[PDB]
C-alpha cells in the first residue's frame, strides 16, 4: 500500500481525492504528524517544504509547488508581469496595473436576453514532470447561477456565430501556458528530492471584441459541484497514480 | 572493554551454562580452552567474555552461583564444564526453598560477600569494565532474591558501571511453585531501580513457542533452553564480533532507554529451529517482528515500539537488509512512536550462528511489555489480597508492606508504559 | 560583466567577476566554573544514590 | 610561511582527517614515509605546502595534525595503517571510555578530563610555527565525541588563541548512516556551544553525500570509505588555497571576510562537481560551462536544499584542472539568464573565483575517475536554514517528551541548557528569515 497525509481539511477538492485513493484499497491514511507518507496533501500557510524528501526510501509527493506564490498572490503577480523578460511589453491579456489598482473592463461581452455579465474560469493541473492540463470542462460564474461549456458554445455559434475554441480557448490556453512556462526555473521539482503538483484555477473576462484577459490566479481553487467527480479522478489518475502506479481524456495537454 | 557474567540459580547457571557452550564454539574455543577456529575475527574482541590464560588458552569471565550444590555439580559434569575457572564456582549447602527473602536476605546474606570477592578480582583484572551481566529466574529464590541482592551490592562498589541481565519470567504453563508471582512481583521492583537494561526471557512465550510453533506437545526445560541460548546468543552478537556497529552496553543502553524505568526489552528470534533451506532476508525480517517469534508473550500491535534494534547474522546483501526494514517501517509506521525519529537500528555480522546460515535477532522496547508485567500483577493480588502463602515470608522478617511497596512500584510502572503508549 | 584583481602565479589564476552591483571571550574561569558546577551536581546524585543504597 | 593546525575529533573526524591527509600526501607528493622528493629544501622551507607540513632534519614532512578520540580503536588504525610512519605518535591522543554518544558526557564528565592533555599537545604544535594562522577543526555533530568534546575544545582554543582563526568542517547527521537516535540532541547542544566560537563552519550531511556516491559513482550501499574519499576532495579544494599558491583564499581570515557578511551566518554551502565513476570506461570530459551549471543542482550541493527559494550574501569557485579565465565568465553569463540567483540587495552580485591548474587529484583504485576539470563552488545562501530546520523539528520531537534527557542530567548537565540552546536554535533560524526575504 502506499501512504498519504491530509492536513488541510477545509479543501473539497482534495477531500474527494482522499476518498477516491482511500476506496482504491491501496491507499491508506497516516496521521497528519507521521513523517512516513508517500503523499502529503498539505496545508495552505507555511507548508513545511523543508521537510520533504527526507526520509529513506520513501517517494514523496506534495499537492503545491514551492514557489507558485508568486502567481497566486495578485501583488505578486503583476510584479511578475512587469519584471518578467519573458512577458512585460508583450502582455496584451493583462490588464493595466500598478489589494492593488487595476483598470476596469468598460466593455465586456454581454450574455443575453437578460444583459448578463460573466468571468470564466477553468481549472489547470501541473503534473510532477511540468506537464501542463487543461481540464476540458470549465464554467462561466455568471451574473444554477453557473453556465457551462456546452451550453455557452451554443450561445456564441446563435448569436456571434463562432465556436468557443475558436473564438475565446485559444487565447485562454495561450495565457496559461504563458505564465507556468515563465516561473517553470523557479519552481520546477525534476531534479528535486521530493515532487510537487498543483491544481491551479485561472480566471478570465471577455471583453466586446471577443478578446480574454487575466483576472487572476488562485492557488487552491474550488470545483463546481457537478464536476467535482470528475477532475478528482484525473488528479488521482495523472497526478498521483503517475508516480505511484497501482495494479478519454479530461485534459488537454498544453504543450512546450 | 570486558564484560563479568554472573549466573545465579538453577534456570541461571543453566541458560548461562547453554549460553557459554554456545558462544564458544562461536569462537572456536574448545571445552579444554584451547581455540581451533579459521578466522581471526573469532579471535578479536573475545577479550569482552574471556580471559586470556597460560599456555593461550581462554577461560571465560564468568561466576557461577547457587545456595544449593547440584546445580553447580552439574554443570561441572557438562561437556564444558572445565572451561569454567574452579574458583569461580560460589555456592552454599541450605538452598532457598523457592523464597525470595531467603535469597534477598537471610540464606543469600551469608554467601553474598564471597560472590563479590570473586567480582573483585575479575573486575580488577579488567582493563576497561563494561559492567555486568546476570542471568537468573525471577520466580525462584535464589537468582531472584540473592540475584537481585547482588546487583544492589554491585551497584555500590562500582556505580558507573553498566548493570544488564536476563530475566527469566515465570508462567503458570511452566511452573514450579504457587508463590512464582510474589518472588517475581518482588524482583521487578529491584530490577525497575538497579539495572539499566533488562531482557524479559518470558517462559510462557518459551512454552507456547515450543508448543504451538515447534510441535513439541510436552517441552523439556531444555527445550526451552535452546530458545534462550539463540537469542542470547543473537543479543550479544554485536558485543563479541568486529562489525559495522562495533558496539558496547552502554551505547545500547542510551539508544534503546528514552526514560531510566522503560529498560525492560522484548527479544525476538528467527527462524524458530527445533533442537537446510535458509530464509531470504524478507522473511527474516516478517519473522523477526512476528509476534510468534517474540520471547516475551506479549502482543506487539497492544502497544508502540519506543525503540528497536536488530540483527541480521550470516552472508546476505546489506541493501536488502535495509530495503526490508525500511519496508517495514513504512508500512507499519502506526506502532511506531513518532516523538523518537530513526527508531530502529539495524547491524549485520557475517558469521551466522552454529547451524543456521541466516538469522535474525530483535530487540524491543515496546510498550507492549506491560502485558507481561500485568499478568503477573494479576496473579500476585489474587493470593495477596487474602495474604495467601505469606507467612512463608513474614517469617523470615519481611513485612506485609514490602509487598505492598512492590505491588504500587509495578503497577507503576505498567502506568508509565501506558502514558506513553497513547502520547503524541 | 566586469573581471576584477586577476593575479597570476604558476599554480594558477584568481579573479572577481561582478553581474549587477548593490542597491567577549568566556573566562577560563568561567568555563571552568560551569565545568565544576557540573561535577558537583554529578556528585550529589551519586551520593544521593550511595545514600539510597545505604538505607 | 603562515601555519595551519589541523584538529580531528572523534571517530568521524579522525577517518576524514585519515582520507585528506592521505589525498594531500598525494596531490603533494609525499610518501607514507613522510618523503618529498619534489622538495630539495631538507628541513626546512616557507614554501606554501609548509602551511600544512612541517619538516624534519631528516626530510620527513609530518602533519600539523591533531588526532583526538576518546576512544582508542579508530585512532589504533591510523598507529598502524599505511600512514603510520607520517605522524608523532603524540599528535594522536586516546583516552579509555568513550562518549557513548551523549553530548553531555563528552563535554563535561570525560571531557574534563584530558582537555589539559590536547592542549598541551597543540601547543606543541603552535610552538613549531612561526605565525599561526589558526585551526581546521573536523568532526561530527551526532557524535558524543565529535559534539560535546569539540564545542568545550572549541571554548578553550578562543581563550589560548584568541587572535587565531578557526575553521570548522561538520558532518550533519543523516538516518540512512547515523550510529544513534540522540544526534539531534547532541547537534542542537554542540552548535549552540560552538557558534561564537567558530569563524566559518562547512556543514556536510551525510545524506547528501549518501546520494551522491549512491546516483553519480553507482554504488548500492555506500560506506563510510566512500563517503570520506569524496569528502577529502570537497575538503581538498577547499584547502587547496592554503597549500598552493594563489590569491584567493591565500589565509584563514580570508574565508570569513570573503564568504561570512554576519558572524552567526557562518555556514557556507558546498557545490561539488563533476563525480565520475571509475568504473565507467569513457567519461566524456564535461565543459567547464557543464560542471560550473551542475554547482546550481541541488543533486551535488553537500546539504540537500534549494537556493531558488532563498538569497546568496557570497560566492566563491575554485576551479582545479584546465580551466581558463574567460572559460568561466561566458559560463557565468549563460547561466545567469537561466537560473534563479538573487543576491540579497545589501550585496553585490558576483562571483570570486581562483583556479589551480593541477587537476583533481585522486586515490589509485578508488571509485573515483580523474577528471580534467572540476570545481567547488562555495556560497552563503539563506536556504541552508532549512537544514536547522529539519534538525530543530526533530529536536522539538523528542524534547516534549523529554525523551533521552536523564543521560544528559545524569552526566551534570541541567535540563535548561537544552531549552537555552534550543532558542539559540529558534534565534539562529530567524536571522537567516530575515536576511533572506
Ligand atoms: N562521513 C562520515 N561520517 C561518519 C564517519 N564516522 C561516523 N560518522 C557519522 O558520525 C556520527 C556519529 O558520530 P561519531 O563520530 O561516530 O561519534 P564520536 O565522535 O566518536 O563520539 P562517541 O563515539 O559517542 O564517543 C553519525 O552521524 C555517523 O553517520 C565517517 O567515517 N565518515
Ligand atoms: N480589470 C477588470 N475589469 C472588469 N472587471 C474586473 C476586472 N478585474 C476584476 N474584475 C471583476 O472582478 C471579479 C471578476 O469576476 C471580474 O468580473
Ligand atoms: N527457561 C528456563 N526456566 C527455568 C529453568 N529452570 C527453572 N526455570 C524457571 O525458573 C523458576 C524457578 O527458579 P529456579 O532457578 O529453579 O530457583 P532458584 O535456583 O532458587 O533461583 C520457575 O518459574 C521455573 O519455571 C530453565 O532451565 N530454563
Ligand atoms: C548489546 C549489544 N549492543 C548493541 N548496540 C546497539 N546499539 C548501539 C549503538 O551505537 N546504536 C544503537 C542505536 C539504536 O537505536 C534505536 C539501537 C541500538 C544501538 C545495537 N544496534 C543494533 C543491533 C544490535 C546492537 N547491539
Ligand atoms: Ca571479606
Ligand atoms: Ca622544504
Ligand atoms: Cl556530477
Ligand atoms: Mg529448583
Ligand atoms: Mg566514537
Redesign the pocket.
Same mark, same amino acid.
Given at each position: 500500500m502506499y501512504t498519504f497525509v491530509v492536513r488541510d481539511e477545509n479543501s473539497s477538492v482534495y477531500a474527494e481525492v482522499s476518498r477516491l485513493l482511500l476506496a482504491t484499497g491501496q491507499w491508506k491514511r497516516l496521521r497528519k504528524d507521521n513523517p512516513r507518507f508517500n503523499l502529503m496533501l498539505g496545508e495552505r500557510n507555511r507548508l513545511p517544504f523543508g521537510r520533504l524528501g527526507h526520509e529513506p526510501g520513501l517517494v514523496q509527493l506534495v499537492n503545491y509547488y514551492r514557489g507558485a506564490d508568486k502567481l497566486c498572490r495578485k501583488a505578486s503577480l503583476v510584479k511578475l508581469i512587469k519584471t518578467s523578460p519573458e512577458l512585460s511589453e508583450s502582455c496584451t491579456w493583462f490588464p493595466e496595473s500598478y489589494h492593488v489598482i487595476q483598470k476596469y473592463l468598460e466593455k465586456p461581452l454581454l450574455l443575453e436576453p437578460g444583459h448578463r455579465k460573466f468571468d470564466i474560469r477553468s481549472w489547470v493541473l501541473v503534473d510532477h514532470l511540468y506537464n501542463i492540463y487543461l481540464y476540458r470542462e470549465g464554467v462561466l460564474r455568471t451574473s444554477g447561477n453557473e453556465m457551462f461549456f456546452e451550453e455557452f458554445n451554443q450561445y456564441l455559434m446563435d448569436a456571434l456565430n463562432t465556436t468557443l475554441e475558436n473564438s475565446i480557448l485559444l487565447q485562454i490556453k495561450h495565457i496559461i501556458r504563458s505564465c507556468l512556462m515563465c516561473i517553470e526555473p523557479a519552481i520546477s521539482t525534476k531534479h528535486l528530492h521530493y515532487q510537487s503538483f498543483q491544481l491551479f484555477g485561472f480566471d478570465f473576462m471577455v471583453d466586446e471584441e471577443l478578446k480574454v484577459w487575466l483576472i487572476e490566479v488562485n492557488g487552491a481553487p474550488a470545483c463546481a459541484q457537478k464536476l467535482y467527480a470528475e477532475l478528482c479522478q484525473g488528479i488521482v489518475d495523472v497526478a498521483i497514480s503517475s508516480v505511484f502506479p497501482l495494479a478519454t481524456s479530461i485534459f488537454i495537454k498544453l504543450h512546450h | 572493554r570486558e564484560i563479568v557474567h554472573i549466573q545465579a540459580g538453577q534456570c541461571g547457571n543453566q541458560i548461562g551454562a547453554k549460553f557459554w557452550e554456545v558462544i564458544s564454539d562461536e569462537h572456536g574455543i574448545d571445552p579444554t580452552g584451547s581455540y581451533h577456529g579459521d578466522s581471526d575475527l573469532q579471535l578479536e574482541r573475545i577479550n569482552v567474555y574471556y580471559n586470556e590464560a597460560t599456555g593461550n588458552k581462554y577461560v571465560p569471565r564468568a561466576i557461577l552461583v547457587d545456595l544449593e550444590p547440584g546445580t553447580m555439580d552439574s554443570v561441572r559434569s557438562g561437556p564444558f564444564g572445565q572451561i569454567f575457572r574452579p574458583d569461580n564456582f560460589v555456592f552454599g549447602q541450605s538452598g532457598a526453598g523457592n523464597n525470595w527473602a531467603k535469597g534477598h536476605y537471610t540464606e543469600g546474606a551469608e554467601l553474598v560477600d564471597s560472590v563479590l570477592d570473586v567480582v573483585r578480582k575479575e573486575s580488577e583484572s579488567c582493563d576497561c569494565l563494561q559492567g555486568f551481566q546476570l542471568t537468573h529466574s525471577l520466580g525462584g529464590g535464589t537468582g531472584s532474591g540473592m540475584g537481585t541482592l547482588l546487583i544492589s551490592k554491585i551497584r555500590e562498589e562500582y556505580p558507573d558501571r553498566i548493570m544488564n541481565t536476563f530475566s527469566v519470567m515465570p508462567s503458570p504453563k511452566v511452573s514450579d511453585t504457587v508463590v512464582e508471582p510474589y518472588n517475581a512481583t518482588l524482583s521487578v521492583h529491584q530490577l525497575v531501580e538497579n539495572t539499566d537494561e533488562t531482557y524479559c526471557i518470558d517462559n510462557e512465550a518459551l512454552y507456547d513457542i515450543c508448543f504451538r510453533t515447534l510441535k513439541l506437545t510436552t517441552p523439556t526445560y531444555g527445550d526451552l533452553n535452546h530458545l534462550v541460548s539463540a537469542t542470547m546468543s543473537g543479543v550479544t552478537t554485536c558485543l563479541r564480533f568486529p562489525g559495522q556497529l562495533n558496539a558496547d552496553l552502554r551505547?545500547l543502553a542510551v539508544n534503546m532507554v528514552p526514560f531510566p524505568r522503560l529498560h525492560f526489552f522484548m527479544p525476538g528470534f528467527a527462524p524458530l529451529t527445533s533442537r537446510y533451506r535458509a530464509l531470504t532476508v524478507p522473511e527474516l525480517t516478517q519473522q523477526m517482528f512476528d509476534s510468534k517469534n517474540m520471547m516475551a508473550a506479549c502482543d506487539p500491535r497492544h502497544g508502540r515500539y519506543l525503540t528497536v534494534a536488530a540483527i541480521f547474522r550470516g552472508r546476505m546483501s546489506m541493501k536488502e537488509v535495509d530495503e526490508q526494514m525500511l519496508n517495514v517501517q513504512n508500512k507499519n509506521s502506526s506502532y511506531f512512536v513518532e516523538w523518537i525519529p530513526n527508531n530502529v537500528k539495524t547491524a549485520v555480522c557475517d558469521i551466522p550462528p552454529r547451524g543456521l546460515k541466516m538469522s535474525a535477532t530483535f530487540i524491543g522496547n515496546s510498550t507492549a511489555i506491560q502485558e507481561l508485567f500485568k499478568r503477573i500483577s494479576e496473579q500476585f493480588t489474587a493470593m495477596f489480597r487474602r495474604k495467601a502463602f505469606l507467612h512463608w515470608y513474614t517469617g523470615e522478617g519481611m513485612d506485609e508492606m514490602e509487598f505492598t511497596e512492590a505491588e504500587s512500584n509495578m503497577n507503576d510502572l505498567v502506568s508509565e508504559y501506558q502514558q506513553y503508549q497513547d502520547a503524541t | 560583466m566586469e573581471v576584477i584583481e586577476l593575479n597570476k602565479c604558476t599554480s594558477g589564476q584568481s579573479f572577481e567577476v561582478i553581474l549587477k552591483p548593490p542597491s567577549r571571550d568566556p573566562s577560563l574561569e568561567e568555563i571552568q566554573k560551569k565545568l565544576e558546577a557540573a561535577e558537583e551536581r554529578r556528585k550529589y546524585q551519586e551520593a544521593e544514590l550511595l545514600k539510597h543504597l545505604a538505607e | 610561511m603562515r601555519e595551519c593546525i589541523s584538529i580531528h575529533?572523534?571517530?568521524?573526524?579522525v577517518?576524514?582527517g585519515n582520507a585528506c591527509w592521505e589525498l594531500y600526501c598525494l596531490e603533494h607528493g609525499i610518501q607514507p614515509d613522510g618523503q618529498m622528493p619534489s622538495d630539495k629544501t631538507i628541513g626546512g622551507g616557507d614554501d606554501s605546502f609548509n602551511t600544512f607540513f612541517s619538516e624534519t632534519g631528516a626530510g620527513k614532512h609530518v602533519p600539523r595534525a591533531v588526532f583526538v578520540?576518546?576512544?582508542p580503536t579508530?585512532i589504533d588504525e591510523v598507529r598502524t595503517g599505511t600512514y603510520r610512519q607520517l605522524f608523532h605518535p603524540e599528535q594522536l591522543i586516546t583516552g579509555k571510555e568513550?562518549?557513548?554518544? +551523549?553530548y553531555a558526557?563528552?563535554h563535561y564528565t570525560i571531557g574534563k578530563e584530558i582537555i589539559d592533555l590536547v592542549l598541551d599537545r597543540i601547543r606543541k604544535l603552535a610552538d613549531q610555527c612561526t605565525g599561526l594562522q589558526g585551526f581546521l577543526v573536523f568532526?561530527? $555533530?551526532?557524535?558524543? @565525541?565529535?559534539?560535546? $568534546?569539540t564545542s568545550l575544545l572549541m571554548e578553550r582554543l578562543s581563550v589560548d588563541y584568541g587572535k587565531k582563526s578557526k575553521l570548522e568542517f561538520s558532518?550533519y547527521?543523516?538516518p540512512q548512516?547515523? @550510529?544513534?537516535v540522540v544526534?539531534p540532541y547532541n547537534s542542537i547542544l554542540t552548535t549552540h556551544t560552538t557558534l561564537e566560537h567558530s569563524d566559518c563552519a562547512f556543514m556536510?550531511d +551525510?545524506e547528501a553525500?549518501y546520494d551522491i556516491c549512491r546516483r553519480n559513482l553507482d554504488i548500492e550501499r555506500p560506506t563510510?570509505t566512500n563517503? +570520506?574519499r569524496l569528502?577529502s576532495q570537497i575538503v581538498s579544494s577547499i584547502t587547496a588555497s592554503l597549500r598552493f599558491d594563489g590569491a584567493l583564499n591565500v589565509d584563514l581570515t580570508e574565508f570569513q571576510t570573503n564568504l561570512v557578511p554576519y558572524p552567526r551566518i557562518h555556514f557556507p554551502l558546498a557545490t561539488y562537481a563533476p563525480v565520475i565513476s571509475a568504473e565507467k570506461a569513457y567519461h566524456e570530459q564535461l565543459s567547464v560551462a557543464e560542471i560550473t551549471n551542475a554547482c546550481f543542482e541541488p543533486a551535488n550541493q553537500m546539504v540537500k536544499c534549494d537556493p531558488r527559494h532563498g538569497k546568496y550574501m557570497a560566492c566563491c569557485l575554485l576551479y582545479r584542472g584546465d580551466v581558463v579565465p574567460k572559460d568561466v565568465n561566458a559560463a557565468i553569463a549563460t547561466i545567469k539568464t537561466k537560473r534563479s540567483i538573487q543576491f540579497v540587495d545589501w550585496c553585490p552580485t558576483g562571483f570570486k573565483v581562483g583556479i589551480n591548474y593541477q587537476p583533481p587529484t585522486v586515490v589509485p583504485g578508488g571509485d573515483l575517475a580523474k577528471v580534467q576539470r572540476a570545481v567547488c563552488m562555495l556560497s552563503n545562501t539563506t536556504a541552508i536554514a532549512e537544514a536547522w530546520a529539519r534538525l530543530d523539528h526533530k529536536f522539538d520531537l523528542m524534547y516534549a517528551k523529554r525523551a533521552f534527557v536523564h543521560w544528559y542530567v545524569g552526566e551534570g548537565m541541567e535540563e535548561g541548557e537544552f531549552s537555552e540552546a534550543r532558542e539559540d536554535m529558534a534565534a539562529l533560524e530567524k536571522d537567516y528569515e530575515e536576511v533572506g526575504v
Open positions: - | 551505547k | - | 575529533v572523534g571517530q568521524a573526524g577517518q576524514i578520540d576518546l576512544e579508530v568513550d562518549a557513548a554518544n +551523549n558526557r563528552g568532526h561530527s $555533530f551526532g557524535g558524543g @565525541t565529535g559534539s560535546g $568534546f558532518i547527521p543523516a548512516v547515523s @550510529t544513534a544526534e556536510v +551525510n553525500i563510510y563517503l +570520506n569528502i
